[PDB]
Amino acid sequence: GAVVGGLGGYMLGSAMSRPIIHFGSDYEDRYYRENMHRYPNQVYYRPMDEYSNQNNFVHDCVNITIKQHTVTTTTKGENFTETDVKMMERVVEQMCITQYERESQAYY
Amino acid sequence: GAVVGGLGGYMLGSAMSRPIIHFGSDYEDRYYRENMHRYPNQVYYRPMDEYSNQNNFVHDCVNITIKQHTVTTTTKGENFTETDVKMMERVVEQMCITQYERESQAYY
Ligand SMILES: [Cl-]
Ligand SMILES: [Cl-]
């Protein structure tokens, strides 16, 4: 809900399909596939009349877009994927078991 | 900052070291390693005197602990890891490039 500093003068583009990007490592390749929805699908940018080259336009766009995405608030639930749910059920169960042993030890 | 329903009567345990869990698949194995800090390191539980077996204690603990973790609010930045940063720089740059082409096309 907050806004990163110095965002005045930037405009928000219309959504686009998140690019399908492939990676060498199978890890990164699968990771992106399962997590891309967690990244933006639109970017912030300044008026064309302010630039003389693509590079500077892109520089500004990438940096402020990532910063704004980063400060954007959200619950951990929407940030978690199927994989995370699976991971948590496993770790929380082991920890819930550790808590049981703690309670039993110092019982009463 | 919010609280999941029916949390009254549950107590929050003290933190513990998140368990190191290994997986068959190298993907899940590496994934957990890089993302475990995103999961809880403490669990909610009810008084020992309310249970007759470990299973039910653990059942309650796991389910409400995950639900409470899930509703917990946070910015996307703290949920992102080194890998995510890398992913975003790549996807946002391509999209920032698409926005440049859109602006150039309908220029002025
Ligand atoms: Cl647009
Ligand atoms: Cl404790």
mmCIF file of C-alpha atoms and ligand atoms in Angstrom:
data_model
loop_
_atom_site.group_PDB
_atom_site.id
_atom_site.type_symbol
_atom_site.label_atom_id
_atom_site.label_comp_id
_atom_site.label_asym_id
_atom_site.label_seq_id
_atom_site.Cartn_x
_atom_site.Cartn_y
_atom_site.Cartn_z
ATOM 1 C CA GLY A 1 0.000 0.000 0.000
ATOM 2 C CA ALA A 2 3.036 2.220 0.509
ATOM 3 C CA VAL A 3 4.947 4.061 -2.208
ATOM 4 C CA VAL A 4 8.699 4.072 -2.794
ATOM 5 C CA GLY A 5 10.301 7.517 -2.772
ATOM 6 C CA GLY A 6 10.744 9.581 -5.921
ATOM 7 C CA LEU A 7 7.996 7.825 -7.845
ATOM 8 C CA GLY A 8 6.457 11.096 -9.012
ATOM 9 C CA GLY A 9 6.716 11.480 -12.754
ATOM 10 C CA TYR A 10 6.751 7.741 -13.329
ATOM 11 C CA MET A 11 3.777 6.155 -15.030
ATOM 12 C CA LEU A 12 2.608 2.574 -14.643
ATOM 13 C CA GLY A 13 2.422 0.587 -17.866
ATOM 14 C CA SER A 14 -0.407 -1.768 -18.729
ATOM 15 C CA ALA A 15 0.015 -5.443 -17.824
ATOM 16 C CA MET A 16 1.645 -7.834 -20.245
ATOM 17 C CA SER A 17 2.177 -11.582 -20.198
ATOM 18 C CA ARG A 18 5.123 -12.365 -17.948
ATOM 19 C CA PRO A 19 7.975 -13.472 -20.257
ATOM 20 C CA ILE A 20 8.825 -17.178 -20.332
ATOM 21 C CA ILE A 21 12.513 -17.310 -19.561
ATOM 22 C CA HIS A 22 14.640 -20.430 -19.754
ATOM 23 C CA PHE A 23 17.804 -21.118 -17.817
ATOM 24 C CA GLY A 24 20.817 -23.367 -18.124
ATOM 25 C CA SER A 25 20.477 -24.875 -14.678
ATOM 26 C CA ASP A 26 17.375 -27.004 -14.309
ATOM 27 C CA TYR A 27 16.994 -25.549 -10.837
ATOM 28 C CA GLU A 28 16.630 -21.964 -12.008
ATOM 29 C CA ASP A 29 14.598 -23.152 -14.957
ATOM 30 C CA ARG A 30 11.987 -24.884 -12.821
ATOM 31 C CA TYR A 31 12.166 -22.252 -10.074
ATOM 32 C CA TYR A 32 11.232 -19.408 -12.403
ATOM 33 C CA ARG A 33 8.342 -21.428 -13.786
ATOM 34 C CA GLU A 34 6.924 -22.014 -10.294
ATOM 35 C CA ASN A 35 7.618 -18.526 -8.959
ATOM 36 C CA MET A 36 7.200 -16.062 -11.842
ATOM 37 C CA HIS A 37 3.696 -15.160 -10.725
ATOM 38 C CA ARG A 38 5.410 -13.634 -7.701
ATOM 39 C CA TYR A 39 7.063 -11.016 -9.858
ATOM 40 C CA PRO A 40 5.530 -7.950 -11.558
ATOM 41 C CA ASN A 41 3.627 -8.118 -14.855
ATOM 42 C CA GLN A 42 3.827 -4.343 -15.439
ATOM 43 C CA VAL A 43 6.540 -1.742 -15.091
ATOM 44 C CA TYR A 44 7.004 1.918 -14.174
ATOM 45 C CA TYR A 45 8.597 4.246 -16.685
ATOM 46 C CA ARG A 46 9.133 7.897 -17.523
ATOM 47 C CA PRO A 47 7.924 9.830 -20.622
ATOM 48 C CA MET A 48 9.730 9.014 -23.880
ATOM 49 C CA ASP A 49 10.486 12.699 -24.416
ATOM 50 C CA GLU A 50 12.895 12.468 -21.485
ATOM 51 C CA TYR A 51 15.232 10.002 -23.138
ATOM 52 C CA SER A 52 17.797 9.942 -25.905
ATOM 53 C CA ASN A 53 18.424 6.199 -25.680
ATOM 54 C CA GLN A 54 16.736 2.916 -24.776
ATOM 55 C CA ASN A 55 19.370 2.007 -22.168
ATOM 56 C CA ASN A 56 18.598 4.892 -19.849
ATOM 57 C CA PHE A 57 14.876 4.344 -20.187
ATOM 58 C CA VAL A 58 15.333 0.704 -19.242
ATOM 59 C CA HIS A 59 17.743 1.544 -16.435
ATOM 60 C CA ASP A 60 15.173 3.757 -14.733
ATOM 61 C CA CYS A 61 12.317 1.358 -15.376
ATOM 62 C CA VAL A 62 14.016 -1.746 -13.990
ATOM 63 C CA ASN A 63 15.364 -0.130 -10.837
ATOM 64 C CA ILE A 64 12.314 1.719 -9.680
ATOM 65 C CA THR A 65 9.975 -1.104 -10.736
ATOM 66 C CA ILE A 66 11.853 -3.623 -8.621
ATOM 67 C CA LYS A 67 12.059 -1.262 -5.648
ATOM 68 C CA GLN A 68 8.307 -0.564 -5.769
ATOM 69 C CA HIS A 69 7.534 -4.270 -6.093
ATOM 70 C CA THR A 70 9.762 -4.985 -3.107
ATOM 71 C CA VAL A 71 8.090 -2.483 -0.754
ATOM 72 C CA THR A 72 4.635 -3.686 -1.762
ATOM 73 C CA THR A 73 2.972 -5.340 1.250
ATOM 74 C CA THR A 74 1.275 -8.752 1.173
ATOM 75 C CA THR A 75 0.614 -11.761 3.426
ATOM 76 C CA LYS A 76 3.010 -14.699 3.407
ATOM 77 C CA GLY A 77 0.186 -16.870 2.066
ATOM 78 C CA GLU A 78 0.005 -15.242 -1.366
ATOM 79 C CA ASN A 79 3.801 -15.416 -1.590
ATOM 80 C CA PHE A 80 3.808 -19.158 -0.849
ATOM 81 C CA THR A 81 3.419 -21.707 -3.625
ATOM 82 C CA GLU A 82 2.475 -25.359 -3.683
ATOM 83 C CA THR A 83 6.119 -26.231 -2.983
ATOM 84 C CA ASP A 84 6.241 -23.927 0.057
ATOM 85 C CA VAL A 85 3.094 -25.473 1.490
ATOM 86 C CA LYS A 86 4.698 -28.868 1.161
ATOM 87 C CA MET A 87 7.934 -27.614 2.795
ATOM 88 C CA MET A 88 6.089 -26.018 5.702
ATOM 89 C CA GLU A 89 3.986 -29.043 6.469
ATOM 90 C CA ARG A 90 7.224 -30.967 6.852
ATOM 91 C CA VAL A 91 9.204 -28.492 8.915
ATOM 92 C CA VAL A 92 6.293 -27.334 11.109
ATOM 93 C CA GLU A 93 5.435 -30.961 11.935
ATOM 94 C CA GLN A 94 8.975 -31.671 13.137
ATOM 95 C CA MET A 95 9.026 -28.487 15.192
ATOM 96 C CA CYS A 96 5.487 -29.185 16.572
ATOM 97 C CA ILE A 97 6.993 -32.591 17.601
ATOM 98 C CA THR A 98 9.912 -30.826 19.286
ATOM 99 C CA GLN A 99 7.445 -28.610 21.149
ATOM 100 C CA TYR A 100 5.563 -31.711 22.314
ATOM 101 C CA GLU A 101 8.782 -33.143 23.775
ATOM 102 C CA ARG A 102 9.528 -29.823 25.473
ATOM 103 C CA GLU A 103 6.047 -29.773 27.005
ATOM 104 C CA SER A 104 6.319 -33.407 28.081
ATOM 105 C CA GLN A 105 9.744 -32.926 29.657
ATOM 106 C CA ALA A 106 8.810 -29.942 31.808
ATOM 107 C CA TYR A 107 5.275 -31.346 31.961
ATOM 108 C CA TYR A 108 2.538 -30.012 34.243
ATOM 109 C CA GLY B 1 -0.358 -8.050 12.316
ATOM 110 C CA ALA B 2 -3.703 -9.828 12.086
ATOM 111 C CA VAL B 3 -4.713 -12.957 13.988
ATOM 112 C CA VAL B 4 -6.253 -16.127 12.573
ATOM 113 C CA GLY B 5 -9.586 -17.100 14.117
ATOM 114 C CA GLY B 6 -9.851 -19.417 17.105
ATOM 115 C CA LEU B 7 -6.325 -18.773 18.324
ATOM 116 C CA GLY B 8 -7.458 -18.227 21.909
ATOM 117 C CA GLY B 9 -6.113 -20.903 24.200
ATOM 118 C CA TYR B 10 -3.091 -21.530 22.010
ATOM 119 C CA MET B 11 0.313 -20.559 23.321
ATOM 120 C CA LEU B 12 3.346 -19.641 21.248
ATOM 121 C CA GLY B 13 6.417 -21.776 21.860
ATOM 122 C CA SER B 14 9.928 -20.396 22.106
ATOM 123 C CA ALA B 15 12.021 -20.313 18.926
ATOM 124 C CA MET B 16 14.141 -23.280 17.953
ATOM 125 C CA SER B 17 16.637 -23.858 15.166
ATOM 126 C CA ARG B 18 14.743 -24.578 11.965
ATOM 127 C CA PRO B 19 15.270 -28.299 11.216
ATOM 128 C CA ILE B 20 17.639 -29.192 8.378
ATOM 129 C CA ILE B 21 15.598 -31.413 6.118
ATOM 130 C CA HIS B 22 16.974 -33.297 3.142
ATOM 131 C CA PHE B 23 15.051 -34.381 0.082
ATOM 132 C CA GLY B 24 15.407 -36.947 -2.660
ATOM 133 C CA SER B 25 15.072 -34.474 -5.495
ATOM 134 C CA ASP B 26 17.970 -32.053 -5.680
ATOM 135 C CA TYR B 27 15.449 -29.362 -6.525
ATOM 136 C CA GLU B 28 13.519 -29.670 -3.279
ATOM 137 C CA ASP B 29 16.760 -30.210 -1.424
ATOM 138 C CA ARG B 30 18.299 -26.946 -2.590
ATOM 139 C CA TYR B 31 14.976 -25.086 -2.492
ATOM 140 C CA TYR B 32 14.413 -25.792 1.191
ATOM 141 C CA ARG B 33 17.949 -24.695 1.989
ATOM 142 C CA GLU B 34 17.429 -21.340 0.250
ATOM 143 C CA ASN B 35 13.887 -20.758 1.493
ATOM 144 C CA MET B 36 13.615 -22.238 5.000
ATOM 145 C CA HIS B 37 14.112 -18.844 6.604
ATOM 146 C CA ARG B 38 10.739 -17.999 5.081
ATOM 147 C CA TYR B 39 9.016 -20.517 7.302
ATOM 148 C CA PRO B 40 8.282 -20.344 11.053
ATOM 149 C CA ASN B 41 10.869 -21.153 13.731
ATOM 150 C CA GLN B 42 8.252 -21.475 16.502
ATOM 151 C CA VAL B 43 4.857 -23.100 16.772
ATOM 152 C CA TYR B 44 1.493 -22.619 18.478
ATOM 153 C CA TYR B 45 0.179 -25.345 20.737
ATOM 154 C CA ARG B 46 -2.389 -26.093 23.413
ATOM 155 C CA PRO B 47 -1.784 -27.163 27.059
ATOM 156 C CA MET B 48 -0.523 -30.729 27.542
ATOM 157 C CA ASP B 49 -3.363 -31.436 29.964
ATOM 158 C CA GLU B 50 -5.728 -31.269 26.992
ATOM 159 C CA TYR B 51 -4.253 -34.248 25.196
ATOM 160 C CA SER B 52 -4.148 -38.004 25.547
ATOM 161 C CA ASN B 53 -1.784 -38.533 22.616
ATOM 162 C CA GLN B 54 1.036 -36.867 20.688
ATOM 163 C CA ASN B 55 -0.784 -37.122 17.342
ATOM 164 C CA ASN B 56 -3.634 -34.831 18.302
ATOM 165 C CA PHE B 57 -1.277 -32.334 19.874
ATOM 166 C CA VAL B 58 0.755 -32.248 16.678
ATOM 167 C CA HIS B 59 -2.345 -32.104 14.495
ATOM 168 C CA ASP B 60 -3.542 -28.934 16.201
ATOM 169 C CA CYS B 61 -0.089 -27.389 16.304
ATOM 170 C CA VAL B 62 0.741 -27.897 12.630
ATOM 171 C CA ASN B 63 -2.583 -26.690 11.265
ATOM 172 C CA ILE B 64 -3.025 -23.551 13.268
ATOM 173 C CA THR B 65 0.687 -22.690 13.081
ATOM 174 C CA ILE B 66 0.655 -22.808 9.296
ATOM 175 C CA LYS B 67 -2.586 -20.833 9.068
ATOM 176 C CA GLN B 68 -1.238 -18.096 11.366
ATOM 177 C CA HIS B 69 2.030 -17.955 9.432
ATOM 178 C CA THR B 70 0.086 -17.645 6.188
ATOM 179 C CA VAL B 71 -2.064 -14.687 7.294
ATOM 180 C CA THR B 72 0.964 -12.874 8.688
ATOM 181 C CA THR B 73 1.577 -9.721 6.626
ATOM 182 C CA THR B 74 4.957 -8.712 5.180
ATOM 183 C CA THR B 75 6.447 -6.888 2.177
ATOM 184 C CA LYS B 76 7.476 -8.844 -0.902
ATOM 185 C CA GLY B 77 11.073 -7.776 -0.261
ATOM 186 C CA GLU B 78 11.564 -9.847 2.890
ATOM 187 C CA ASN B 79 9.969 -12.817 1.123
ATOM 188 C CA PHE B 80 12.388 -12.542 -1.814
ATOM 189 C CA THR B 81 15.764 -14.260 -1.740
ATOM 190 C CA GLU B 82 18.950 -13.811 -3.710
ATOM 191 C CA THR B 83 17.510 -16.089 -6.406
ATOM 192 C CA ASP B 84 14.321 -14.011 -6.670
ATOM 193 C CA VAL B 85 16.310 -10.811 -7.056
ATOM 194 C CA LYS B 86 18.205 -12.414 -9.892
ATOM 195 C CA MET B 87 14.951 -13.643 -11.510
ATOM 196 C CA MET B 88 13.296 -10.237 -11.250
ATOM 197 C CA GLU B 89 16.189 -8.341 -12.731
ATOM 198 C CA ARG B 90 15.873 -10.592 -15.759
ATOM 199 C CA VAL B 91 12.120 -10.534 -16.217
ATOM 200 C CA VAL B 92 11.637 -6.843 -15.340
ATOM 201 C CA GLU B 93 14.347 -5.863 -17.843
ATOM 202 C CA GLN B 94 12.604 -7.719 -20.671
ATOM 203 C CA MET B 95 9.259 -6.198 -19.745
ATOM 204 C CA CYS B 96 10.834 -2.694 -19.348
ATOM 205 C CA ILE B 97 12.147 -3.315 -22.927
ATOM 206 C CA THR B 98 8.644 -4.246 -24.084
ATOM 207 C CA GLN B 99 7.319 -1.044 -22.515
ATOM 208 C CA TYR B 100 9.976 0.951 -24.381
ATOM 209 C CA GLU B 101 8.799 -0.537 -27.691
ATOM 210 C CA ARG B 102 5.186 0.241 -26.794
ATOM 211 C CA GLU B 103 6.108 3.846 -26.011
ATOM 212 C CA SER B 104 8.163 4.156 -29.192
ATOM 213 C CA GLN B 105 5.418 2.704 -31.384
ATOM 214 C CA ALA B 106 2.650 5.008 -30.186
ATOM 215 C CA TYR B 107 5.321 7.646 -29.556
ATOM 216 C CA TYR B 108 4.582 11.278 -28.693
HETATM 217 CL CL CL C 1 0.845 0.679 -21.678
HETATM 218 CL CL CL C 2 8.896 -23.157 24.856
#
